[PDB]
Amino acid sequence: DLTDAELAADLAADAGKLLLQVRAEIGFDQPWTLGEAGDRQANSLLLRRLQAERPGDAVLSEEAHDDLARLKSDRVWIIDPLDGTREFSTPGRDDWAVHIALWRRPEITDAAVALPARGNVVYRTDTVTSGAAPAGVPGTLRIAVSATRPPAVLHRIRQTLAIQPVSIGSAGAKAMAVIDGYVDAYLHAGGQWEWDSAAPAGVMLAAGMHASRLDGSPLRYNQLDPYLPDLLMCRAEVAPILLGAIADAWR
Ligand SMILES: [Ca+2]
Ligand SMILES: [Ca+2]
Ligand code: NA
Numbered sequence: 001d002l003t004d005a006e007l008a009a010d011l012a013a014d015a016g017k018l019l020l021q022v023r024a025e026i027g028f029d030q031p032w033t034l035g036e037a038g039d040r041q042a043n044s045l046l047l048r049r050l051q052a053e054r055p056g057d058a059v060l061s062e063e064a065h066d067d068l069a070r071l072k073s074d075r076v077w078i079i080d081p082l083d084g085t086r087e088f089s090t091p092g093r094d095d096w097a098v099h100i101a102l103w104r105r106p107e108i109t110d111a112a113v114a115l116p117a118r119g120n121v122v123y124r125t126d127t128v129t130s131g132a133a134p135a136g137v138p139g140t141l142r143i144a145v146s147a148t149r150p151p152a153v154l155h156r157i158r159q160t161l162a163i164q165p166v167s168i169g170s171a172g173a174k175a176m177a178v179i180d181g182y183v184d185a186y187l188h189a190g191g192q193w194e195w196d197s198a199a200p201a202g203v204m205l206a207a208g209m210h211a212s213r214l215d216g217s218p219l220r221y222n223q224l225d226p227y228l229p230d231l232l233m234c235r236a237e238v239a240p241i242l243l244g245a246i247a248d249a250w251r
Helices: 004-026 031-053 152-157 171-180 194-206 236-248
Strands: 058-061 075-083 097-104 107-115 121-124 141-145 163-167 185-188 210-212 231-234
Touching: 004 031, 004 075, 004 097, 004 107, 004 121, 031 058, 031 075, 058 194, 075 171, 075 194, 097 171, 097 194, 107 171, 107 194, 141 171, 141 236, 152 163, 152 236, 171 185, 171 194, 171 231, 185 236, 194 210, 194 231, 210 236, 231 236
Parallel strands: 058 075, 141 163, 141 185
Antiparallel strands: 075 097, 097 107, 107 121, 185 231, 210 231
């Protein structure tokens, strides 16, 4: 008998525990095998528990076929059973996450992000707080970006703004680094899926921070095509500066 937020948190933790077990059982000799097992077993747990505890809700999971029944539903769980599979599959890495979000017909109303290797901490929309003090040196930004080849937009905004990119695996880990104050912002372009941003966005917004498309428009979920090209998540104070610079870069 859990609230949707309590369930999101419990699902995230439980999947987190299972992933930690898989990591210990399978080990790191074959990264691909380890990653596949984590993806598959975390997915199986989450679908089993959502069917048992929310039999009426639709589920959109990275690791399951998408039958689009969710388009007619008022309640949809949007989940990534293991975000940062590569990182998970690498010895010593703690930048991987479980994403559990509930979409209600519309916004992400309840959500949780677990970082299992970080003491299985679970960030949740019903307990995350709005006390964020501006961290770091004035006039300079630390921005979390993925461990891939940088988009054209960040190159351009770095001409005008002092920025140190911080390489972090996993969308969830990057978003929670914003929450923690380890970085000022998390910026992504070039493509992503709804389950990558739904739970982090829910938590971000619940913390009183900013989550939008790069052009400032709201993140939209439970779309036919669950692909979201770009995003910006950041401290509230930082949003005008970055949205401004992004818009200025389109000149
Ligand atoms: Ca995944
Ligand atoms: Ca992912
Ligand atoms: Na199963």
